[PDB]
RNA sequence: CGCUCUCUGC
RNA sequence: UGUGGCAGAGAGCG
């Protein structure tokens, strides 16, 4: 309830004119007050529409000011062009900045003038520095200047923040004012004709610098920001890659004193174990060279902080490192060219000096792993291998990007890259031919996509046809669904938390063992991911083919095999001007159904093969190896105690034993820590990388101005929890500026906190961070009922595509691969399901969402609507709340910190109740009926459809099950058992279980099975209504936790809930 | 004291209620709170000292009222209560707990 | 359907609301079993 | 008279009138109001007199 | 005859029906309608005559 | 379970 | 009407 005051001050500051007028609009769920709001509205518009002073009425209608709820504020203000400079000249009295063109290796990666690199606009491209966000730099500057203006009279630590950010913003505004501000077009692009006389990389530098200086709260933050902002203006290729590299060594220097553990059964369990840090001597010399590069690039204060920290190697000063490790990735992306980014990967050194003893074992281990994965389904003759074709055609992801193509649906032309639409096209013209796999050769090389991420290389993406997916689908699904019952993969270690993705950095650590951890992200072009990998899988397929007798399965397996045959020789379309290059690349990357598990397999075989060579010089027992695609760590335990020389020699042996296979590596051995791209542990404490650029994006999505405010707030929340903290007021300023909409050149509307923070399809943020909010009042109920009525909208483009011939044909062809006695129950169902993935096509989503926003605006302008009773969640919570009773409590501190970078209130909760004892309610459609259909088919009929289908007679249900391949005897047994009344109740239990509101970012981490939280929740037991008592206890926990987060103190609760309200609520439970 | 809420937790986990039943045990839980135990503790002593007689008001559908009335009628002499009140209490107890 | 003493419907006592909603539950469940058979 | 609502809730309290399981026990509550009591009291006596 | 629904309440009362628990007495209430009973009564005599 | 977003190995 | 993906998990819509 504070946002709106900052909104008012922002409006007053930005416009400032006599002509700038401000027009509230209100609402109330109470008839009389609502009609008085209507009145107020009318009279205000009239008075505005009559050149009368508006300031007189504002006293008379005090009632609206006290009890009504705000929606929005309108604004009539004229063009007033160029006001940014007219404000900004004062905050720019320092000296501007000069680039240094002789820093980056390439020529165009320097921050030189555009015209020196792009004389013609026809060859200009903003894609090498595109912020890719529908908000301007001028917007960012306006926000910064307003913040600076309002914080112009404070005298505290706040003033030290203001002086620091003022000096930084002076450096920035000095750099911009040297030339001026670029002006956005309607699309938020920056054309050639504005950037012609300015540096090419000024905008990204500006945005990133704003993001950094808005995240300054201390002196060391100021040092970091001044030392990165002045070098990120020139260096754009060797900065985040440089400073983020030493961290991998630093983790091997932090003594553990107190630890968190994880079980095989995936539960945290703290340990007071102490572990030293047996670091060798030569890695310090490496680290010094890295700091020498750091100083040689032009960094002075931040080497000083890393060198004076090593005098003590304490863990209390250590979050600084983590802080630094996050300050590197908030400088922007290194959006270089498709060509040179591919050539970062497409440099190869293949040699006739490697072993053969290694590759043969490698091939065999891959073979064996494949057989372990595939023994059960290949043998027991599973439907999904038999019906692999249909399985892949249902699971066609509708963003999949195979080969842009000119289509026509009746009377249109479409340039879709989506493979579902391509399949719809190819079914009609007789070209659908999944058994005949296309080649990938000179006659048909592959396109590319570009994956950028700061501090690392630009990675590449294959863009394949749609036959390869269909071939790979069934086998890879059985592989995943097997190996998540098994070690060595992220599918087994993943839900949200600690006790997961790693969960065994910290069992097998002491002064007996070590751990070798290794980044393997460059190992895609390597000589060990070519021929042996493919031939190993091919051999395994031969074994598995001889391990079955049915013929569709042999066909599917032979097609997967032939896919690996064709992918063994693979060329790559890349244009360059007029001519087209195609390069020999017979190796592995993503853009495939297979890449994750197969890379994990190959790395597993590789590390298992390497690890049988250290045994020639050491005695150890391998306790654990873990592989998640392109990373790997192995722990190993010894017959004796560890030394510095053994770690060093082991590292050299690892490096040279990879060198024997012509494989580059930075071998890293340690005792307490690891480092990988996204996270790391030091001293038995998990930190994380907070490298999510807010004001600069990777690529250009398809969302609106609106939703980008929500993504930016989500990234803010994440980065804040991770450690990187930005000023929340700035984020709110951006949200209002991005939800602002131009109805004309001079009319502009601004919504309020009570529209953006309400649970709907229009939610953007929350009134109190780290807490979703619900509604006990009339008013949230009112607007939620209103907005739920409006979420359901239409798309004429979708309507005409779904009314064409190819869509009908597609449903029919899907159908005819199965039985032919259901025509109005599933064909409509499959069409309704395909509709859920036609919306991926951007113009459909844009039509629907622009229509949705227009429907919103035609009740933001004029008064509001009651929406006719359509029930939602807050209706229920409104009835649950008035039988609670609070009392002040006092919990002690008995739980350990193991995520230091969190805010102190969240940590205080962790420091008073426990971290996660994880639970499960359903691992997907478990109840009675989908685990039969998923055994005889793959089809996934929606629970709406089942809730209807069970309500029908038992005859056409019997027909429907027989139509899905099932025999008659099991249907007869199902009807005789009388389970349909049970699966009504199980399905409605599953409907209440669909409430996903346990995992938003702060509820993600808290343990609700705690005894300390539970003794506060004194709700007596009634019985025979499990859903209600479940949700009541859950909701009471959420009340306690949210009060704790927002206020720190604790409370107890009590709900002597009447039986009458249990029953009155029971019918609204299992609806909506 | 024991808090009202934890005592109700113990009693409710004992009684094993049913949210879909018209039970003869929800009425036990009426008025268990403090500020009344205080009131009774204060009233008994004040009345026995001042020798002011004191009536009763109870609902025969509740059966913990009559069970605590047993203790009450034991530790307080019968003539301290007005006649019709304890007669109703005794009659209730004899009719629906004993015979 | 229901032939309660309708003076009892006035009361916001717990037992009265309980009785009303329980009686509606019985009648709607009777309709559930009738729909179950008769389909 | 004895109160209608008090007597109704007392009887339903005695009977354990469940909501889930059917019973032969809802039907005892049919016609427990006053204005029928007086009708019977006036009917028996009027019939025996006449 | 008795109407069907008046008898369905009695059969449900003797066969006390928990909504959740599948006691199989639902099957006892299957096919109880009128004009199936006339069908049987005609069928038996017509067959034993024919 | 169908789609957008968050990052994740790519 | 000019186009940047595979799978893991967490939210928001059916």
Residues of E near D (Cβ–Cβ under 8 Å) read 12-20
Reported as type and span, the H/E element at residue A470 is helix A467-483
Q: Could you tell me the CATH number of the domain that includes residue A956? A: 1.20.120.1400
Residue B32's φ and ψ, nearest 5 degrees, are -70, -20
Residue pair A882/A864 in contact by the 8 Å Cβ criterion: no
Of B22, B27, B61, the CB nearest to D16: B22
Q: Could you tell me the CATH number of the domain that includes residue A622? A: 3.30.70.2480
- What span, in angstroms and rounded, lies between the C-alpha atoms of A1052 and A69? 31
* Experimental resolution (Å): 4.2
Residue pair A310/A291 in contact by the 8 Å Cβ criterion: no
Scanning A298-395, the segments in alpha helix (DSSP H) are 301-309, 319-327, 338-345, 357-380, 383-386, 388-394
Closest CA to the C1' of G14: that residue is: A836
Residue pair A574/A580 in contact by the 8 Å Cβ criterion: yes
Q: Which residues pair with A235 in a beta bridge?
A: none
Asked if A952 lies within 8 A of C14 by C-beta distance, the reply is no
Taking CA–CA distances from D20, the nearest residue in chain E reads E18
- Range A704-724 burial, b when 16+ CB lie within 10 A, else e: bbbbbbbbbbbbbbebbbbbb
**B-C C-beta contacts closer than 8 Å:** 7
Best CA proximity match to A207, nearest among A826, A936, A726: A726
Residue A70's φ and ψ, nearest 5 degrees, are -70, 150
A32 and A126 in one domain? no
What was the experiment behind these coordinates? cryo-EM
- What span, in angstroms and rounded, lies between the C-alpha atoms of A372 and A483? 9
- Tally the domains of chain A: 8
Closest CA to the C1' of G12: that residue is: A761
Instruction: Write down which residues 204-263 in A have CB closer than 7 A to strand G.
Output: none
* Chain C residues with CB-CB distance to B26 below 8 A: 14
| Last residue before each gap in chain B (C to N over 2.5 A) | none
* Chain C residues with CB-CB distance to B20 below 8 A: 22, 25
The DSSP line for A699-733 is: S--S--HHHHHHHHHHHHHHHHHHT----HHHHHH
Residue pair A355/A660 in contact by the 8 Å Cβ criterion: yes
**Contacts with A237 (C-beta within 8 Å, 6 or more apart), sequence order:** A104, A105, A106, A109, A334, A336
Give yes or no for CB of A405 within 7 Å of strand G. Answer: no
CA atoms within 13 A on the CB side of E2: 9
Nucleotide with the nearest C1' to A462 CA: G5
Range of the domain at A454: 337-396+438-489+520-594
Q: Which two tokens stand for residue A611?
A: 């690890």
- What span, in angstroms and rounded, lies between the C-alpha atoms of A146 and A158? 15
C1' (G7) to CA (A413) span, angstroms: 32
A648 and A504 in one domain? yes
Q: Residue A978: which region, alpha, beta or left (left: phi > 0; alpha: psi -120 to 50)?
A: left
Asked if C36 lies within 8 A of E26 by C-beta distance, the reply is yes
Give yes or no for CB of A400 within 7 Å of strand G. Answer: yes
**Contacts with A596 (C-beta within 8 Å, 6 or more apart), sequence order:** A590, A629
- Range A576-601 burial, b when 16+ CB lie within 10 A, else e: eeeeeeeeebbbbbbbbbbbbbbbbb
- What span, in angstroms and rounded, lies between the C-alpha atoms of A508 and A505? 7
Nucleotide with the nearest C1' to A449 CA: G4
Q: Could you tell me the CATH number of the domain that includes residue A1044? A: 3.30.230.140
> Which one-letter DSSP state was computed for residue A748?
E
Q: Beta strand pairing status for A668-670 and A573-576? A: unpaired
DSSP, collapsed to helix, strand or coil, labels residue A414 as: strand
User: For residue D29, how far is the Cα from the chain centroid?
Assistant: 5
Give yes or no for CB of A700 within 7 Å of strand G. Answer: yes
Reported as type and span, the H/E element at residue A833 is helix A827-838
Measure Cα distances from A934 to A361, A383, A470, A561, A937 in Å: 37, 9, 18, 25, 5
> Does C33 contact chain E (CB < 8 Å)?
yes
Residue for token pair 């869509």:
A807
- Residues A732, A10, A201, CA angle at the centre, nearest 5°? 65
Last residue of a domain, one of A987, A1006, A1025: A1006
Give yes or no for CB of A805 within 7 Å of strand G. Answer: no
Q: Which two tokens stand for residue A72?
A: 């929005």
Give yes or no for CB of A125 within 7 Å of strand G. Answer: no
Q: Which two tokens stand for residue A590?
A: 């993503």
Q: Which two tokens stand for residue A243?
A: 């400073």
Give yes or no for CB of A461 within 7 Å of strand G. Answer: yes
Instruction: Determine whether A535 is exposed, middle or buried from the number of CB atoms within 10 Å of its CB (0-12, 13-18, 19+).
Output: middle
DSSP, collapsed to helix, strand or coil, labels residue A363 as: helix
- What span, in angstroms and rounded, lies between the C-alpha atoms of A236 and A217? 26
A180 and A121 in one domain? yes
- What span, in angstroms and rounded, lies between the C-alpha atoms of A228 and A297? 11
Reported as type and span, the H/E element at residue A242 is helix A240-243
Residue for token pair 């680039």:
A99
Residue pair A555/A470 in contact by the 8 Å Cβ criterion: no
Best CA proximity match to A320, nearest among A497, A502, A312: A312
Asked if A1020 lies within 8 A of B17 by C-beta distance, the reply is yes
Closest CA to the C1' of F9: that residue is: A629
The DSSP line for chain B is: ---HHHHHHHHHHHH---TTS--SSGGGGTT-STTTHHHHHHHHHHHHHHT--B-----TT-SHHHHHHHHHHHHS-GGGB-HHHHHHHHHHHIIIII-
- What span, in angstroms and rounded, lies between the C-alpha atoms of A847 and A833? 20
Q: Which two tokens stand for residue A658?
A: 């990879």
SS3 for A648-707 is HHHHHHHHHHHHCCCCCCCCEEECCCEECCCEEEECCEEEECCCCCCCCCCCCCCCCHHH
Best CA proximity match to A1043, nearest among A918, A936, A909, A922: A909
User: For residue A971, how far is the Cα from the chain centroid?
Assistant: 43
Give the strand order in the sheet containing A631-638: A620-627, A631-638, A513-519, A668-670
Residues in B 21-50 with any Cβ partner in A closer than 8 A: 21, 26, 29
A571 and A619 in one domain? no
Closest CA to the C1' of F8: that residue is: A678
A651 and A508 in one domain? yes
Nucleotide with the nearest C1' to A715 CA: F6
Of E19, E20, E26, the CB nearest to A978: E26
Last residue of a domain, one of A178, A204, A235: A235
- What span, in angstroms and rounded, lies between the C-alpha atoms of A625 and A487? 9
Give the strand order in the sheet containing A1051-1054: A887-888, A1051-1054, A1017-1018
Residues in E 4-23 with any Cβ partner in A closer than 8 A: 19-20, 22
**Contacts with A24 (C-beta within 8 Å, 6 or more apart), sequence order:** A44, A70, A72, A73
A649 and A526 in one domain? no
A532 and A512 in one domain? no
Reported as type and span, the H/E element at residue A620 is strand A620-627
Last residue of a domain, one of A867, A897, A932: A867
Q: Which two tokens stand for residue C27?
A: 């009648």
- What span, in angstroms and rounded, lies between the C-alpha atoms of A972 and A994? 31
Q: Which two tokens stand for residue A745?
A: 């050149």
* Chain B residues with CB-CB distance to D12 below 8 A: 22
C1' (F7) to CA (A681) span, angstroms: 18
A114 and A32 in one domain? no
A784 and A730 in one domain? no
Asked if B17 lies within 8 A of A1021 by C-beta distance, the reply is yes
A860 and A771 in one domain? yes
Residue D17's φ and ψ, nearest 5 degrees, are -70, 95
Radius of gyration, alpha carbons of chain E: 15
A626 and A687 in one domain? yes
Give yes or no for CB of A279 within 7 Å of strand G. Answer: no
- Residues A620, A621, A626, CA angle at the centre, nearest 5°? 115
Best CA proximity match to A517, nearest among A649, A637, A680: A680
- Residues A37, A39, A44, CA angle at the centre, nearest 5°? 95
Q: Which residues pair with A669 in a beta bridge?
A: A516
Taking CA–CA distances from D22, the nearest residue in chain E reads E16
DSSP, collapsed to helix, strand or coil, labels residue A580 as: strand
Q: Which two tokens stand for residue D50?
A: 């006449």
Min Cα distance B12 → chain A (Å) is 6
A970 and A1058 in one domain? no
Residue pair A1024/A990 in contact by the 8 Å Cβ criterion: no
């Amino acid at each position: 309830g504070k946002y709106n005051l900052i909104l008012s001050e922002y409006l007053s500051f930005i416009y400032n004119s006599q002509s700038a007028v401000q027009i509230p609009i209100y609402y109330s769920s109470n008839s009389e007050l609502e009609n008085r709001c209507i009145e107020f509205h009318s009279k205000c518009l009239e008075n505005s529409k009559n050149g009368l002073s508006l300031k007189k009425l504002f006293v008379e209608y005090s009632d609206v000011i006290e009890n009504a709820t705000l929606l929005s504020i309108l604004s009539y203000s004229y063009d007033k062009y160029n006001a940014v400079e007219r404000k900004l000249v004062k905050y720019a009295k320092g000296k501007p900045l000069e680039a240094d063109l002789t820093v980056n290796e390439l020529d165009y990666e320097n921050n030189k003038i555009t015209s020196e690199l792009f004389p013609t606009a026809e060859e200009y491209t903003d894609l090498l520095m595109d912020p890719a966000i529908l908000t301007s730099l001028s917007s960012n500057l306006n926000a910064v200047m307003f913040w600076l203006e309002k914080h112009e009279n404070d005298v505290a630590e706040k003033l030290k923040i203001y002086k620091r950010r003022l000096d930084l913003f002076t450096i920035v505004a000095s750099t911009v004012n040297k030339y001026g501000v670029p002006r956005h077009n309607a699309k938020y692009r920056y054309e050639y004709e504005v950037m012609k006389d300015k540096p090419y990389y000024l905008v990204t530098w500006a945005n990133s610098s704003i993001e950094m200086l808005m995240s300054v709260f201390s002196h060391e933050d100021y040092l970091i920001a001044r030392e990165l902002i002045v070098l990120s203006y020139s260096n754009r290729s060797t900065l985040a890659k440089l400073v983020s590299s030493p961290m991998s060594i630093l983790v091997a220097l932090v003594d553990i004193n107190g630890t968190f553990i994880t079980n095989e059964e995936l539960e945290l369990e703290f340990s007071n174990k102490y572990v030293r840090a047996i670091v060798p001597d030569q890695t310090f010399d490496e680290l010094k060279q890295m700091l020498d590069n750091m100083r040689k690039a032009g960094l002075t204060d931040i080497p000083k902080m890393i060198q004076d920290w090593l005098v003590d190697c304490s863990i209390e000063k250590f979050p600084l490192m983590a802080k630094i490790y996050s300050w590197s990735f908030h400088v922007g992306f290194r959006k270089q060219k498709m060509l040179d980014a591919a050539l970062d990967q497409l440099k190869t050194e293949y040699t006739e000096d490697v072993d053969d003893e290694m590759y043969r074992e490698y091939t065999m281990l891959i073979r064996d792993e494949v057989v372990k994965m595939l023994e059960e389904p290949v043998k027991h003759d599973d439907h999904l291998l038999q019906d692999s074709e249909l399985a892949g055609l249902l699971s066609m992801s509708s963003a999949s990007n195979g080969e842009s193509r000119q289509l026509k649906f009746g009377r249109k032309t479409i340039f879709s890259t989506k493979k579902n639409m391509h399949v719809m096209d190819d079914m009609a013209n007789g070209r659908y031919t999944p058994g005949i796999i296309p080649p990938v050769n000179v006659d048909k090389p592959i396109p590319l996509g570009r994956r950028d991420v700061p501090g690392r290389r630009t990675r590449i993406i294959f863009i394949l046809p749609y036959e390869y997916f269909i071939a790979q689908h069934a086998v890879v699904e059985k592989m995943l669904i097997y190996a998540k019952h098994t070690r060595e993969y992220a599918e087994f270690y993943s839900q949200s938390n600690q006790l997961l993705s790693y969960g065994d950095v910290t069992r097998f650590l002491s002064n007996n063992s070590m751990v070798l951890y290794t980044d393997v992200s460059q190992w895609d072009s390597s000589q060990h991911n070519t021929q042996p990998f493919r031939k190993g899988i091919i051999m395994g397929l031969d074994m598995l083919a001889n391990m079955t007798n049915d013929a569709r399965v042999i066909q599917t397996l032979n097609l997967y095999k032939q896919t690996q045959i064709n992918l063994m020789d693979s060329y790559v379309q890349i244009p360059d001007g007029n001519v087209i290059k195609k390069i020999q690349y017979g190796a592995v990357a993503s853009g495939e159904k297979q890449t994750k598990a197969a890379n994990s397999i190959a790395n597993l075989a590789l590390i298992k093969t390497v690890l049988s060579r250290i045994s020639n010089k050491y005695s150890f027992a391998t306790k654990i190896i873990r592989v998640d695609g392109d990373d790997n760590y192995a722990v190993l335990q010894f017959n004796t105690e560890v030394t510095k020389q053994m770690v060093q020699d082991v590292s050299n042996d690892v490096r040279e034993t990879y060198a024997r296979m012509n494989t580059k590596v930075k071998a890293l051995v340690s005792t307490v820590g690891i480092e990988i791209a996204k996270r790391y542990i030091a001293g038995g404490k998990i930190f994380f990388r907070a490298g999510i650029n807010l004001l600069n994006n990777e690529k250009k999505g398809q969302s609106t101005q609106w939703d980008q405010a929500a993504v930016l707030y989500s990234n803010y929340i994440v980065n804040r929890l991770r450690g990187f903290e930005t000023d929340r007021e700035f984020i709110l300023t951006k949200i209002m500026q991005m939800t602002s909409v131009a109805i004309t050149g001079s009319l502009r509307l601004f919504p309020s906190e009570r529209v953006l923070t309400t649970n709907s399809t229009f939610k953007v943020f929350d009134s109190e961070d780290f807490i979703i909010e619900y509604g006990t009042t009339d008013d949230e109920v009112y607007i939620q009922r209103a907005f739920m009525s409006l979420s359901s909208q239409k798309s004429g483009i979708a309507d005409e595509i779904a009314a064409s011939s190819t869509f009908k044909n597609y449903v029919s062809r899907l159908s005819e691969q199965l039985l032919f006695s259901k025509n109005n129950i599933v064909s409509r169902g499959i069409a309704l399901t395909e509709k859920a993935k036609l919306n991926s096509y951007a113009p459909i989503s844009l039509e629907k969402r622009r229509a949705q926003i227009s429907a919103l605006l035609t009740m933001l302008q004029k008064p509001v609507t009651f929406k006719s009773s359509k029930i939602t969640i807050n209706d229920i919570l409104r009835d649950i709340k008035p039988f609670f009773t609070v009392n002040e409590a006092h919990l002690p501190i008995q739980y350990q910190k193991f995520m230091p970078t969190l805010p102190d209130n969240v940590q205080y909760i962790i420091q008073c109740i426990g971290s996660r004892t994880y639970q499960i309610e359903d691992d997907g459609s478990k109840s009675a009926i989908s685990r039969l259909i998923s055994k005889y088919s793959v089809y996934k009929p929606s629970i709406e459809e089942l809730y209807k289908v069970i309500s029908l007679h038992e005859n056409e249900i019997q027909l429907y099950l027989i139509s899905l391949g099932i025999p008659k005897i099991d249907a007869d047994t199902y009807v005789g058992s009388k389970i349909y009344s049970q699966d009504k109740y199980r399905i409605l239990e599953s409907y209440v279980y669909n409430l996903l509101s346990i995992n938003y970012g702060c509820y993600q981490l808290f343990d609700f099975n705690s005894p300390d939280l539970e003794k506060l929740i004194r709700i007596p037991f009634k019985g025979k209504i499990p859903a209600v008592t479940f949700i009541l206890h859950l909701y009471a926990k959420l009340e306690v936790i949210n009060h704790a987060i927002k206020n720190g103190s604790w409370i107890s609760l009590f709900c002597n809930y009447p039986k009458s309200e249990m029953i009155k609520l029971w019918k609204k439970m299992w609806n909506i | 004291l024991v808090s009202t809420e934890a005592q109700i937790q113990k009693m409710s986990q004992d009684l094993q209620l049913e949210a879909l039943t018209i039970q003869s045990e929800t009425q036990f839980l009426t008025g268990i709170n403090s500020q009344a135990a205080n009131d009774c503790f204060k009233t008994l002593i004040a009345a026995m000292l001042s020798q002011r007689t004191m009536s009763l008001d109870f609902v025969t559908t509740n059966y913990m009222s009559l069970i605590s009335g047993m203790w009450l009628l034991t530790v307080v002499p019968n003539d301290m209560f007005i006649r019709e009140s304890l007669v109703a209490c005794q009659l209730a107890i004899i009719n629906t707990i004993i015979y | 359907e229901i032939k309660i003493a309708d003076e009892v419907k006035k009361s916001n006592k717990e037992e009265s609301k309980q009785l009303l909603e329980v009686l509606k539950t019985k009648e709607e469940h009777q309709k559930e079993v009738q729909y179950e058979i008769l389909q």
